[PDB]
Design a protein around this ligand. Structure first.
Ligand SMILES: C[C@@H](CCC(=O)O)C(=O)O
Ligand SMILES: C[C@@H](CCC(=O)O)C(=O)O
Lengths: 292, 291
């Protein structure tokens, strides 16, 4: 299988290296020379334009920063692609943008999936990414052998856009949970309840979630959590802020009522102005900026 | 070790808790000022008394299961002088941290041992003896108390000094309230986006957002057939009770000067929902997010 990989950034570079390692012919494009060089070092044939990368490909994967860039990439390359080429967008973009680009690709007789990922650069390098996939079951089946070498998990979420929707809903819940957990630890400390005692109680009770059992925002109870390593990501505030921006777009576009999600979105937007480079669990230390 | 226990408060939680103590071979001396409550407890073997001071007079252990801090304080004031010196008082009521520490000090000033030991599990947990006791007070006192708590309990966890049981419960339940609202928001947003309830359920439960509020208390019918959404939102854990716990969380927040932006938002949402939907499971808050 020949794969054109468009977007060879912090995620795209290690993803494409895993595809090379699984026996695929990988063709590539990135507008950053440092990204392109790094990708060529691990076996990707890099081209000067995306239409060139796509010309001989059975599969075209996009990993790009915004819906606008994904859409422009599609209109740039679709005429260059061969018929029934499989397009996989693994960018994280809005549900609306995902569906528009899916419809565009299928208008050209391509097969298309949205397949955004969770797991970050670490997951990308380790080939343990979780792909949340929207599109046809038969298209996903065809895509599976390409996805497998990048993936720890592959989940079919529904029709086009469902992958983006599922990821955005989960990460909105996560953001709320990470703040709620942080509030709980600060309240406990002011009440004279130790961090370890609260940890032991919450992890054995109804409040338990990844935000505490793995991402515990106070040092000690989970030695590997970012709180014990100066809040090094992990999962950066910058990226959580980005996902919440998309959750808010989804909320605006549907007219949905999401008071805690929107409050979390506000909290992380403000926090990202100062601490974008910290793990999102570091929000524990910005709660007194909220003080009224 | 078989003991004489006074049980003050024989309501929805108190009655089944006391029945398990009788079943374990303890002599249980009960009082409740609602005769209906007392009648039910008597039917399962509790010796019911005319007054709280009478029930307390010959007890090694005194358990209170009462609705508010005010009622606990009132009870302690009426009974502490009647109890034998160095009687062990366990308050399994859910009351504010401040109230718990006040009544703990009151008990100790009268020469009594005292623990706060609020419980989770509701009436079903109470009947099955699978309650979780979250305990605050002295380690040795808890040691003394264990044989009494064991026949009512699935879990006994020591949380710290007096008040820490209440603190741990109120922190956990604040988080829960926030999570239940957030899960409801996700499911409604998913529906407006064309993502099926089953699909969202499968994703969140396999991902970082998983929590009891979704995996056990899923607010949409279908993915978890045992959840309240499939049974007309019959509790479960009532909105009335969650609103009570959120009131206590807001008391703790006010007393400490903590900032809890989402916990306080969740308290405001549940306070409004409880006005007309007190009798529904707290997952029913999902109704507020739909038009
Ligand atoms: C187990 C995984 C296969 C892909 C991989 O593990 O590389 C999956 O089925 O998603
Ligand atoms: C829960 C308590 C034992 C009592 C019981 O299972 O009823 C314990 O395991 O500490």
């Amino acid at each position: 299988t020949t794969i054109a990989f468009l977007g060879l950034g912090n995620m795209g570079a290690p993803m494409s290296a895993n595809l090379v390692g699984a026996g695929h012919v990988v063709r590539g494009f990135d507008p950053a020379p440092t990204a392109a060089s790094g990708a060529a070092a691990h076996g990707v044939a890099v081209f000067r334009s995306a239409p060139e990368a796509v010309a001989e490909a059975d599969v075209v994967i996009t990993m790009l920063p915004t819906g606008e860039v994904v859409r422009r990439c599609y209109t740039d390359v679709l005429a260059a692609a061969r018929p029934a080429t499989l397009f996989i967008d693994s960018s994280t973009i809005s549900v609306t943008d995902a569906r528009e680009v899916h419809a565009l690709a299928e208008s050209h007789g391509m097969l298309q999936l949205d397949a955004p990922v969770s797991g970050g650069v670490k997951g990308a390098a380790a080939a343990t990414l979780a792909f949340m996939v929207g599109g046809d079951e038969s298209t996903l089946r065809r895509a599976r052998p390409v996805l497998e070498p990048m993936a720890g998990k592959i989940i079919h979420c529904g029709a086009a856009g469902a992958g983006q929707a599922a990821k955005v809903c989960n990460n909105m819940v996560l953001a709320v949970q990470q703040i709620a957990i942080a509030e709980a630890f600060v309240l406990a400390e002011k009440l004279g309840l130790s961090a370890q005692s609260l940890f032991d109680v919450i992890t054995g009770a109804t409040g338990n979630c990844w935000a505490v059992h793995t991402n515990c925002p106070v040092p000690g109870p989970v030695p590997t959590s970012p709180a014990n390593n100066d809040f090094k990501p992990g999962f950066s505030t910058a990226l959580m802020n980005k996902d919440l921006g998309l959750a808010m777009d989804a909320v605006a576009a549907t007219g949905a009522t999401a008071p805690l999600g929107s409050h979390a979105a506000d909290i992380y937007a403000k926090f990202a102005a100062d601490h974008a480079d910290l793990d999102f669990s570091a929000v524990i230390h910005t709660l007194r900026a909220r003080a009224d």
